[PDB]
Every structure is written in C-alpha cells, then in structure tokens.
Amino acid sequence: SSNLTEEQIAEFKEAFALFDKDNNGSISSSELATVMRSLGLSPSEAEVNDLMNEIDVDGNHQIEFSEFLALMSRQLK
C-alpha cells in the first residue's frame, strides 16, 4: 500500500462509522459498499467481488474500519 495519508484516513473513519450501527468501529459488507462510494469513488461489480473475497468469509460478517482501509488501498482511485 503506497498512498493515502492522515487526513485521508480521517474522511474514511467518518464514512465507515457513518454506517457502523454498533458504533464500535465495524460495519456489515452491505454497508461497506456505501462508505466506499461515499468517499468519492465508484468501482465495478468485478472490483467488488475481489474486494469482498479478500475479506468476506462466507455470507455476512462484521467489517472493521481497519482491514476495510488496509485493503481498500489495493484499489482506490
């Protein structure tokens, strides 16, 4: 991961947490797709399949703001 910075992660936290019901710092995949386009981007279906397969363990799960960005950096802008 060679990009992004401090301020960048900031805007990401507000987004990811914006849909984090538990408010503990974790959101559901269905919510990750939103925070994704909310930051100012818009990948494609194929891009989503790989993005989830790199984190999704089966069907539903609790995503973490950490791994969320720690991986999103593999396909951002």
Output the domain CATH number for residue 22. 1.10.238.10
Query: What's the one-letter identity of residue 47?
Result: E
Return d(Cα 52, Cα 5) in angstroms, integer: 23
Does residue 28 have a known ligand-binding role? no
3 is in an annotated binding site: no
Contact in structure between 76 and 9 (CB atoms under 8 Å): no
Angle between helices 29-39 and 45-53 (to 10 degrees): 130
Mapped onto helix, strand or coil, the DSSP state of residue 73 is coil
Rounded Cα–Cα distance for residues 14 and 52 (Å): 21
Residue 75 annotated as binding?
Answer: no
Cβ atoms of 65 and 25 within 8 Å: the answer is yes
Give Cβ neighbours of residue 13 (< 8 Å, ≥ 6 apart): 65
Instruction: Extract the tokens encoding 43.
Output: 């990948």
**Taking the CB of residue 17, how many other CB atoms lie within 10 A of it?**
15
- Please tell me the experimental approach by which this structure was elucidated: NMR
| Cβ neighbours for 17, distance < 8 A, ≥ 6 positions apart | 23, 25, 27, 65
- Please give the tally of structural domains in the chain: 1
**Ligand-binding site membership of 50 (annotated):** no
Q: Tell me if 49 is assigned to a ligand binding site.
A: no
Residue 53 marked as a ligand binder:
no
**DSSP H or E run through 10:** helix 6-18
**Residue 41: which domain range?**
1-77
